[PDB]
Write a protein that binds this ligand. Structure first.
Ligand SMILES: [Mg+2]
Ligand SMILES: [Mg+2]
Ligand SMILES: [Mg+2]
Lengths: 549, 390
DNA sequence: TAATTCCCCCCCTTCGGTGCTTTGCACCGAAGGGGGGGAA
């Protein structure tokens, strides 16, 4: 029946009461699925019958289980969840098959009726009351209260997870050679014992679980490979994702694109080279959830490439603690990176991608460093150690960047791999003024009220220009003024500015930015073979800045 | 048992736990298992909504792991003197009195806030949650309770060498006695069985101007900007009589001025620059802010102040050349050194403005931390104001 | 017309905090919205 495990004390927030939401009418099919379920659990003491002494109520309904023949009973505990005290979640992440070591024998078990086998605090049970809406004589409906953990309650997952750990602890304290992966009520049991001894000790585990009230039905007891575990197919020496089906639609709505992108981020954990940026670019604009977006040519090629990749079968491999993890990174382009973590060449532990664009202004080196950080954190999560990187950036370029950059940057041990395209910096700022080149004193200022401004430059050789900017800003006026100097000068320029904002934007060597003005500035800087940028304060009457301003 | 209450109107810490490495997880499991064995901690369930991060560190010449719990949010909401001449000594020494708190039980009503979660590799098991039963480490309330016996347990050694001005902060004792190096080790060795740095060479870095003869237009511009920026810090900088010299649309490399009144003005500014800025008094009520800048080849510059441009202390930390490519290690060592200096001088841990991205610091700072306490920090983004503090 | 919960990942959008450009831009980090994945 139910477990003899102790009940976790649960209380409500101070000055609150239980829900009193009247049950909504249910369709004829779902009442017969509920009276059956309630009759079955009422005999076992899982739910008890109550009378007029309990005023609280909560709606109930039912969905179809993954078996597609049995019904799952749920209670809409949203109000009670609002008035229920807070819990700390003990589930910290999803186990990954790449973190699994090769085991001689493996068995996957599922506890039958996991929540219904764990008792619930007595002084809380009255808040879990509900009514079954028989649709015969409209009334009377029969009223029950839960005696076990109900599905739909916010505290049920945390309570169950911490209760199942206490049940598995006595078994694990005396079987250190057995590895038990516990997710909810799903158990993956691995051992190096032979098949006979493994099965014999598995039967000991199933007896230990049954002694604690948790049954393990034989229909959910897996004994032969491939094992369907946590969305993966586990063979003796490899693992794959369960088959992923992509929609084949001639007209894509916002939701369909959203579904397709989600199914590609999931497929990218083992398939290499999955690109989704073009597909996700159609989701910009808050276009409802039914609006039909035609596929652009740039977003069609990415879809064709992603469909080609998924045609071939791709397998993973298991972890080997003795060897070392090697992570290799490639630049796809437009701020997209792919990475493969493996131990042997062409045998990937896991593949992934990184396409985040942090900050308005950034270059290749910062994105590579962020990708390295993400891979390091993920590897620490999975394998508990930092891998060794094969980066496409040269040691000279990284040395120059980290010596010249004003912020503390560091990446773990890595080696250079000659994989085109290579990460590089497209221009550098001179540390000293250029002798023989024209010196430009540039300045811009925009009115605060009507948002009209003037930006211009003056040269030491007798060449000044002003262009009035409409619908502008004080800082963007400075950016335009700097851009003006680059446009009408030679291959070598000395440039003197006045704004700290332009200094901070420029001297970080950005390559791409969210604004077109900075992109044009970067292009002009790229075609300039020597540039110097110096800052002078404002309103000090400094020589040179007066003529432009 | 001292009843401890939170700040009026505050709640408990609810911080998540960052991922840890395999060695750290194993060490944490062993340590928590033993402290549960003699009842320093107790297992708890999810009905406790409070949580603080935890990890493990290796201290100097110990090779054994030590548990470090991040009681930073709990300290800010707990709501419970400095040695006047601790810096007057020359050989202050740090002692780790951290296991003495495990003998005073924590009050029952407060234990729920001292909860932490140990994760697992590859998430093979839900994280195991524990709560403290005795006075923890890293909590700003443990010294406040242990003091009533901490005084009685040092009273003997306090009348033996009357030259010992001591301090107890967080989990460490700063002992300062103005004596020779030979006597101090014997004095320290006496102290440890009784229970069983360099605070006089810290010099500020004055603001300086470049020295040369050929002052180019760019050089004059940089010097004028430096003087204008420093005028806020040092009242008296006029820079007017030099700004009146740079007149015209001259090129960026012409050395025009050489010998005029500009030399006298530069000398006048140089003379007033070598002063210890009168004022800048330490108010024992405002928060201490320490800002750190990276100046190239393994050099960092730190400024500790309460309000801007009024620097309580300025300094440079070099440690070693750029041989350590590990910028995070150098930054961590600098942070620890600055924190130790602040506790020695002012007795209050500052608030740091680290010049590093959040992800890099949060990923790598645990690998090199070696101190029992943790300072509060934020992350800046000040592209070069063009030297200035060098 | 079905309606719930809890975790992990992704992308996009709003909005508040902070600092300098200073009372208004520029930027960044949390929270929410959708979508995948896992379980009850
Ligand atoms: Mg089950
Ligand atoms: Mg299950
Ligand atoms: Mg299942």
């Amino acid at each position: 029946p139910i477990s003899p495990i102790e009940t976790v004390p649960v209380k409500l927030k101070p000055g609150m009461d239980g829900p009193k939401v009247k049950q909504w009418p249910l369709t004829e099919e779902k009442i017969k699925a509920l009276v059956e379920i309630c009759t079955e659990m009422e005999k076992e003491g899982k739910i008890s019958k109550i009378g007029p002494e309990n005023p609280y109520n909560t709606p109930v309904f039912a969905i179809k289980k993954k078996d597609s023949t049995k019904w799952r009973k749920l209670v809409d505990f949203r109000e009670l969840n609002k008035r229920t005290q807070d819990f700390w979640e003990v589930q910290l992440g999803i186990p990954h098959p790449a973190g699994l070591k090769k085991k001689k024998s493996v068995t996957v078990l599922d506890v039958g009726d996991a929540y219904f086998s764990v008792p619930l605090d007595e002084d809380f049970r009255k808040y879990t009351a509900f009514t079954i809406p028989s649709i015969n004589n409209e009334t009377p409906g029969i009223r029950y209260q839960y005696n076990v953990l109900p599905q739909g309650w916010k505290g049920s997952p945390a309570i169950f997870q911490s209760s199942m750990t206490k049940i598995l602890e006595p078994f694990k304290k005396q079987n250190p050679d057995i590895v038990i992966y516990q997710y909810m009520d799903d158990l993956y049991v691995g051992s190096d014992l032979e098949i006979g001894q493994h099965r014999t000790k598995i039967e000991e585990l199933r007896q230990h679980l049954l002694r604690w009230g948790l049954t393990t039905p034989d229909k959910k007891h897996q004994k032969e490979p491939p094992f369907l575990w946590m969305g993966y197919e586990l063979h003796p020496d490899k693992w794959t994702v369960q088959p992923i089906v992509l929609p084949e639609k001639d007209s894509w709505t916002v939701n369909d694109i959203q579904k397709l992108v989600g199914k590609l981020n999931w497929a990218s954990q083992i398939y290499p080279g999955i690109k989704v940026r073009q597909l996700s670019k159609l989701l910009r604009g808050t276009k409802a959830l039914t609006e039909v977006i035609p596929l652009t040519e740039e977003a069609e090629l990415e879809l064709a490439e992603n469909r080609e990749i998924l045609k071939e079968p791709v397998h993973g491999v298991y972890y080997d603690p003795s060897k070392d993890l090697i992570a290799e990174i490639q630049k796809q382009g437009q701020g997209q990176w792919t990475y493969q973590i493996y131990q042997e060449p062409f045998k990937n532990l896991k593949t992934g991608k990184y396409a985040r664009m942090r900050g308005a202004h950034t270059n290749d080196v910062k994105q590579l460093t962020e990708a390295v950080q993400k891979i390091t954190t993920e590897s620490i999560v999975i394998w508990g150690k930092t891998p060794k990187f094969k980066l496409p950036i040269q040691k000279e370029t990284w040395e120059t960047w980290w010596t010249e950059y004003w912020q503390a940057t560091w990446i773990p041990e890595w080696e250079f791999v000659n994989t085109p395209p290579l990460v590089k910096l497209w221009y550098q700022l001179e540390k000293e003024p250029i002798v023989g080149a024209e010196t430009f004193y540039v300045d811009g200022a925009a009115n605060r009220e009507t948002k009209l401004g003037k930006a211009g430059y003056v040269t030491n050789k007798g060449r000044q220009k002003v262009v009035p900017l409409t619908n502008t800003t004080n800082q963007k006026t400075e950016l335009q003024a700097i851009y003006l100097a680059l446009q009408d000068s030679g291959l070598e320029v000395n440039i003197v500015t006045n704004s700290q904002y332009a200094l901070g934007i420029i001297q970080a060597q950005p390559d791409k930015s969210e604004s077109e003005l900075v992109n044009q500035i970067i292009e002009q800087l790229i075609k300039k073979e020597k540039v110097y940028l110096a800052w002078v304060p404002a309103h000090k009457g400094i020589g040179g800045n007066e003529q432009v301003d | 048992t001292v009843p401890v209450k939170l700040k009026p109107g505050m709640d408990g810490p609810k911080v998540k736990q960052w991922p840890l490495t395999e060695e750290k997880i194993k060490a944490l499991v062993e340590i928590c298992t033993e402290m549960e064995k003699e009842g320093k901690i107790s297992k708890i369930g999810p009905e406790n909504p409070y949580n603080t991060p935890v990890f493990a560190i290796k201290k100097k010449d110990s090779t054994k792991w030590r548990k470090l719990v991040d009681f930073r949010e709990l300290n800010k909401r707990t709501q419970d003197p400095h040695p006047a001449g601790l810096k007057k000594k020359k050989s202050v020494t740090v002692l780790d009195v951290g296991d003495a708190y495990f003998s005073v039980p924590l009050d029952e009503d407060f234990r729920k806030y001292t909860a932490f979660t140990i994760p697992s590799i590859n998430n093979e098991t839900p994280g195991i949650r524990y709560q403290y039963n005795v006075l923890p480490q890293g909590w700003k309330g443990s010294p406040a309770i242990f003091q009533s016996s901490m005084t009685k347990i040092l009273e003997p050694f306090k009348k033996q060498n009357p030259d010992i001005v001591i301090y107890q902060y967080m989990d460490d004792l700063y002992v300062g006695s103005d004596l020779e190096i030979g006597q101090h080790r014997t004095k320290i060795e006496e102290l440890r069985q009784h229970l069983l740095l360099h605070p006089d060479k810290w010099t500020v870095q004055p603001i300086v101007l470049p020295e040369k003869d050929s002052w180019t237009v760019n050089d004059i511009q940089k010097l004028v900007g430096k003087l204008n920026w420093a005028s806020q810090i040092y009242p008296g900088i006029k820079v007017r009589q030099l700004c009146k010299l740079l007149r015209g649309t001259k090129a960026l490399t012409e050395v025009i001025p050489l010998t005029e009144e500009a030399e006298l003005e530069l000398a006048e500014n140089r003379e007033i620059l070598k002063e210890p800025v009168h004022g800048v008094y330490y108010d024992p009520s405002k928060d201490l802010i320490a800002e750190i800048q990276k100046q190239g080849q393994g050099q960092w510059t730190y400024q500790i102040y309460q309000e801007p441009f009024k620097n309580l202390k300025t300094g440079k930390y070099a440690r070693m050349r750029g041989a350590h490519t590990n910028d995070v290690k150098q930054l961590t060592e600098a942070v620890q050194k600055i924190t130790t200096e602040s506790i020695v001088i002012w007795g209050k841990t500052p608030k740091f403005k680290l010049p590093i991205q959040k992800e890099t610091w949060e990923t790598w700072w645990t690998e090199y931390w070696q101190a029992t306490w943790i300072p509060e920090w934020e992350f800046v983004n000040t592209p070069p104001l063009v030297k200035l503090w060098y």
